Design a protein around this ligand. Sequence first.
Ligand SMILES: Cn1nnc(-c2onc(O)c2C[C@H](N)C(=O)O)n1
Ligand SMILES: Cn1nnc(-c2onc(O)c2C[C@H](N)C(=O)O)n1
Ligand SMILES: [Zn+2]
Ligand SMILES: [Zn+2]
Ligand SMILES: [Zn+2]
Lengths: 258, 258
Amino acid sequence: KTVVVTTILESPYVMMKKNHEMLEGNERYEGYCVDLAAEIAKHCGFKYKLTIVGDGKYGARDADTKIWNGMVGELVYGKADIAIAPLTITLVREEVIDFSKPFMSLGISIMIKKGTPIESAEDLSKQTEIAYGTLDSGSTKEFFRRSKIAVFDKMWTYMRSAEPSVFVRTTAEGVARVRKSKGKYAYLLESTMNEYIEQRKPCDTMKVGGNLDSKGYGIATPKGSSLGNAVNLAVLKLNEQGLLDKLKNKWWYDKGEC
Amino acid sequence: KTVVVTTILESPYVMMKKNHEMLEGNERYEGYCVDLAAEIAKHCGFKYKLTIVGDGKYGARDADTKIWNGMVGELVYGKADIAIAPLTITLVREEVIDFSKPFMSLGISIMIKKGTPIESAEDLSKQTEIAYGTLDSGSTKEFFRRSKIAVFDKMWTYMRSAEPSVFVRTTAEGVARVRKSKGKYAYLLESTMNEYIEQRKPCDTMKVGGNLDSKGYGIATPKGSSLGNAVNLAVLKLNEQGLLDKLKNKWWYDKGEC
Ligand SMILES: Cn1nnc(-c2onc(O)c2C[C@H](N)C(=O)O)n1
Ligand SMILES: Cn1nnc(-c2onc(O)c2C[C@H](N)C(=O)O)n1
Ligand SMILES: [Zn+2]
Ligand SMILES: [Zn+2]
Ligand SMILES: [Zn+2]
């Protein structure tokens, strides 16, 4: 009866409270999605338990085994009843799970160490001195892997064959790589995350250029789940009442340090 | 079998071609949604007929009779099979009809005659010299009617009682009113349209301030329609293929004249 929620440890969506070792259950975490989960549950009328995705991934289907990993996998195989996280709504994913209307709009963007001579994706594609990559098992990698657009296809051709690997296991790893690369590495990640990091110490990174695409994050449930309808309506209601905008301001700027 | 498509004459979504008089059927029209309709039809494998919504409205429910008008009404009462137009995804609408994932992201915005002493919604709410209104039977009017935000609530209190009426029957009427009111009227409309008009002659209007909210347009179908699933997946594929962005560029900036 208690709804198992799968989510991912990604700041500021879900983070461990400093004194979590002395706290229990859902009280161990804080963040945008923790606040959202509480609201969704209250509006749909269900008790829930937050769980961090086992493999720490968002979700991709293995080309060879055809098995889904990440949060998507936990829903597909019945390990979780719902996913409340910054999970990108994509075709390949909507084919196996359901998504509520988006609770946040975003797009792929470029993150650079301040001072880096890069202003756009075209710039990256036309040079070689500055390496660039994306998250592994994510929607961004898939975006480049399938793009028919000249600039993006060129970028994918480079990234897929670059050595050492330009891909990272977690968003945090990508951000750290940018910060330690002395301007020789640019990271491709979603806009709102890029924006968030730009407001965090050491305030040494920034978003450059416009977004490469437009899409959104949605609350996911297993195909045919009975929670689907109510969750979707809850998201729409919460968006219209301004809760989502308040939560972004709370976790992004109200706590900004730059 | 031929799918009856309901849409609305709104530039640059659906417009009569310069030579429409010598054309028949779907050939009489051109625009973003005309192009989108053809793509959706091709991917879902259906033949269709474009029809212009009878009462020229988007869709609102009569508070007394509870009867829906506009494109929403044509779907609810079975007069149309699908709505392919810049129809805003809202809670009250999703309760009676189905919406595909967003094909365009936008937000409420402020349009002014160039030179008008207004920079934000707050500025409008604090003065009386400049009147401002919204479209009738639309999602924006509902936004202000339900807003509990100090500024927005204050604005609604004024608009609902303003004399003469600050509300308009069509988007065009609102734009024309701003242009001929010598800066004494400001119009609240959705960002994408505001931006479009700003790049059209006589280049005498401009969008000011940020969007008041964030939401999107979706393709709508009657509840339980057999087209729902395919249309939804089609929208996702088109966005990822870059088609939606291509269309935006084709009808917005490739035709700008300022
Ligand atoms: C929360 N967040 N910030 N960036 C990202 C991000 O950047 N590239 C990706 O593939 C992702 C993951 C993405 N949200 C997904 O659902 O796969 N997620
Ligand atoms: C295409 N377009 N530009 N502005 C609008 C607009 O501005 N205020 C409204 O209520 C609307 C209509 C809205 N899309 C709706 O679906 O009701 N629609
Ligand atoms: Zn710890
Ligand atoms: Zn609430
Ligand atoms: Zn196509």
